[PDB]
Amino acid sequence: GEDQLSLLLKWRSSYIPPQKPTNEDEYKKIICKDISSEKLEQHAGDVSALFINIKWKLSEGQSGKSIEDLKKLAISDKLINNGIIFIWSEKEILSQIVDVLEAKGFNYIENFMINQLSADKALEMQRKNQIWSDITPEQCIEQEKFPPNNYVQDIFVNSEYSFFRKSKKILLMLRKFNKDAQLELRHQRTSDIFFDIFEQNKPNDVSKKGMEFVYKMIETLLPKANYSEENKGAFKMMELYADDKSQPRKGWISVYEQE
Amino acid sequence: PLDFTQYAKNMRKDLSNQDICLEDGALNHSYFLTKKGQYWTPLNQKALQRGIELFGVGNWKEINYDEFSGKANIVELELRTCMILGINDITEYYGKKISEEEQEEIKKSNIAKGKKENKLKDNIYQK
Amino acid sequence: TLEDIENEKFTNLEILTHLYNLKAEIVRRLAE
Amino acid sequence: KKGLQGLLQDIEKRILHYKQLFFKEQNEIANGKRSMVPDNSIPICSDVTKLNFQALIDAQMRHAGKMFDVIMMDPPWQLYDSLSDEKIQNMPIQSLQQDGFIFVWAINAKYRVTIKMIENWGYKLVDEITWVKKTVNGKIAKGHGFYLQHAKESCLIGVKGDVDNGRFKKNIASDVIFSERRGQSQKPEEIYQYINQLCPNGNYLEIFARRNNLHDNWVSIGNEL
Numbered sequence: 328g329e330d331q332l333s334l335l336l337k338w339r340s341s342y343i344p345p346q347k348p349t350n351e352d353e354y355k356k357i358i359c360k361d362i363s364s365e366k367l368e369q370h371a372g373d374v375s376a377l378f379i380n381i382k383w384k385l386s387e388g389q390s391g392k393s394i395e396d397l398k399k400l401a402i403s404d405k406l407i408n409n410g411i412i413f414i415w416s417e418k419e420i421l422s423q424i425v426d427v428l429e430a431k432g433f434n435y436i437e438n439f440m441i442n443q444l445s446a447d448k449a450l451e452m453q454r455k456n457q458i459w460s461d462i463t464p465e466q467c468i469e470q471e472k473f474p475p476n477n478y479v480q481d482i483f484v485n486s487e488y489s490f491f492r493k494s495k496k497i498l499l500m501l502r503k504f505n506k507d508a509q510l511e512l513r514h515q516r517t518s519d520i521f522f523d524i525f526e527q528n529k530p531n532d533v534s535k536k537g538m539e540f541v542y543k544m545i546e547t548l549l550p551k552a553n554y555s556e557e558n559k560g561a562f563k564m565m566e567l568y569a570d571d572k573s574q575p576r577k578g579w580i581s582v583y584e585q586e
Numbered sequence: 587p588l589d590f591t592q593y594a595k596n597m598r599k600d601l602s603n604q605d606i607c608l609e610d611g612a613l614n615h616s617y618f619l620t621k622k623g624q625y626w627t628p629l630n631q632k633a634l635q636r637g638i639e640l641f642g643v644g645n646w647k648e649i650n651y652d653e654f655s656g657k658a659n660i661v662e663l664e665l666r667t668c669m670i671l672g673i674n675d676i677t678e679y680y681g682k683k684i685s686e687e688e689q690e691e692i693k694k695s696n697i698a699k700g701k702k703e704n705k706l707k708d709n710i711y712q713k
Numbered sequence: 714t715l716e717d718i719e720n721e722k723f724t725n726l727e728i729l730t731h732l733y734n735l736k737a738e739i740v741r742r743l744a745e
Numbered sequence: 746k747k748g749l750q751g752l753l754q755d756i757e758k759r760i761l762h763y764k765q766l767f768f769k770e771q772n773e774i775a776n777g778k779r780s781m782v783p784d785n786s787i788p789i790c791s792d793v794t795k796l797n798f799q800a801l802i803d804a805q806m807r808h809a810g811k812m813f814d815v816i817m818m819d820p821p822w823q824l825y826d827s828l829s830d831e832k833i834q835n836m837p838i839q840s841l842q843q844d845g846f847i848f849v850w851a852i853n854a855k856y857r858v859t860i861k862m863i864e865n866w867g868y869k870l871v872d873e874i875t876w877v878k879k880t881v882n883g884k885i886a887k888g889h890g891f892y893l894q895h896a897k898e899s900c901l902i903g904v905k906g907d908v909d910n911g912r913f914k915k916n917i918a919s920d921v922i923f924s925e926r927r928g929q930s931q932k933p934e935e936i937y938q939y940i941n942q943l944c945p946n947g948n949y950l951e952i953f954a955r956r957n958n959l960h961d962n963w964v965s966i967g968n969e970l
């Protein structure tokens with residue numbers, strides 16, 4: 328198991344998602360009707376990680392939010408004031424995202440991307456080169472069983488685009504600097520690029536382990552925002568557009584939309 | 587559609603430097619076969635020949651400060667003079683003030699004597 | 714030292730200039 | 746001093762060997778030796794703050810009948826010689842293109858200002874190409890930053906004019922390059938392959954090029970060209 332695909336996906340053995348806590352004091356789950364129209368300063372305060380787990384529409388046929396929805400969303404100073412915004416970026420609306428977020432005091436500081444590798448393309452390459460005759464790509468994600476690809480650039484999820492094909496998922500990181508306080512950081516504790524496996528039909532669905540890698544990137548960059556006994560009722564990590572897949576997490580404020 | 591060879595030749599003719607491209611627009615590969623800053627232009631070769639005509643061989647300092655304006659390697663001047671005279675070690679010609687026609691005569695007789703001695707390596711008479 | 718002047722990232726011209734400068738310095742030392 | 750005499754003999758032998766090597770190199774060069782630079786490459790060695798872009802405009806108009814289809818730059822970002830952000834903005838890119846793409850390689854410190862640059866030149870940011878640095882054994886060549894380890898280089902792409910005219914292709918190549926570090930600022934040749942997939946047989950302009958950037962049908966501009 329020393330091939331390129333096995334080497335680039337070896338982080339998955341060390342980033343298993345934890346069980347969701349049964350302790351109500353270890354998180355704050357908030358259900359909203361419209362996050363963009365919801366005042367969040369009454370739900371949190373002085374958070375250091377505003378992970379916006381947004382899904383963008385881009386095309387009119389599919390669902391998701393829009394740049395107007397990001398514009399209407401209020402991120403105040405009584406909300407996150409010394410912290411990072413983690414927001415899923417797209418190539419079409421990267422300029423609009425950075426414009427609207429630098430309108431709200433959040434300046435771009437870092438790019439954290441996921442190199443999209445396709446399990447279906449890896450399976451089709453294994454079938455063309457040749458236990459893998461009947462296995463779903465979702466089963467490949469969940470059983471951690473992957474073909475021994477030695478050239479992963481042929482199994483990039485090269486999704487449809489009017490331009491260069493979309494084979495990466497960018498998590499934009501933007502900091503609102505505070506001149507009165509200090510964001511206690513850990514520097515260079517994780518790379519800005521990691522390879523994670525994806526599905527061909529779901530290029531925007533990060534896996535459980537990839538989402539855990541993102542969460543541990545956030546929680547390693549900001550350790551004082553983690554679940555400590557001093558952070559009880561005053562959690563420093565918040566998620567917008569939360570899902571029941573990973574967000575009931577220790578030390579995290581989960582904001583859902585229309586549950 | 588346009589042919590890109592003639593297009594590149596014309597664009598190099600009116601845009602690229604005289605060292606980058608030749609007189610017909612063709613790429614001068616000698617420019618890109620040496621590091622930038624040391625190419626030994628044909629003007630440099632002509633200046634070296636003028637220096638050997640005006641000053642003696644082995645007078646690289648006064649050659650450099652009268653035909654290259656001090657922006658030339660003395661070692662490179664000696665090496666080029668070796669190439670245009672045909673001996674790896676130019677010791678007999680040290681301070682002889684060789685003109686153009688005599689330079690070519692020495693080069694031709696030198697290549698001939700190198701063929702006679704059967705020791706020509708790169709059109710230079712090996713010692 | 715021959716190590717600093719025999720590097721493979723140096724062209725033959727700069728290698729030869731380094732050789733000739735070292736030769737001049739050691740000839741001066743010989744005359745000393 | 747017998748040891749210094751022996752060292753003198755040693756360097757005399759090295760002088761003779763390297764003299765023969767130099768003579769062989771100059772005899773090969775003068776006779777027929779061709780450099781690695783392609784024949785249809787158009788190199789321009791000039792400073793972009795001093796380059797007359799009007800001459801490039803006129804030559805490109807009369808010799809190609811149109812303007813450039815792809816413009817690529819790896820700007821010397823202020824932290825070889827460097828350039829200010831305003832100085833890179835002052836380059837008349839708007840005149841150099843009417844329809845096509847721009848390819849600006851952006852470091853992390855100069856990413857948002859790169860987006861602003863391509864917006865201020867009249868382009869609309871539609872794509873980015875990220876170069877993931879690779880090791881010899883096939884892993885990610887991790888680096889260093891302030892928040893995360895930097896193992897990426899992003900080439901932000903802005904679009905202009907009427908691109909849908911049959912000169913440019915859609916749904917081509919990838920936005921990710923997984924290539925080894927083969928230099929110091931040396932971007933991979935995969936960006937040139939991807940550009941040629943984007944606009945086959947097109948007119949390309951490269952600003953801040955080096956001798957490894959010289960390609961077929963590419964007008965390359967650099968300080969050290």
Ligand SMILES: Nc1ncnc2c1ncn2[C@@H]1O[C@H](CSCC[C@H](N)C(=O)O)[C@@H](O)[C@H]1O
Nearest residue numbers: 792793819821825826930931932953967968
């Ligand atoms: N004012 C200026 N005009 C033109 N070129 C310049 C310049 N200032 C810097 N440069 C050049 O711009 C280049 C930046 S590094 C370019 C690296 C190249 N893209 C590669 O892939 O190898 C260097 O060659 C530098 O010397």
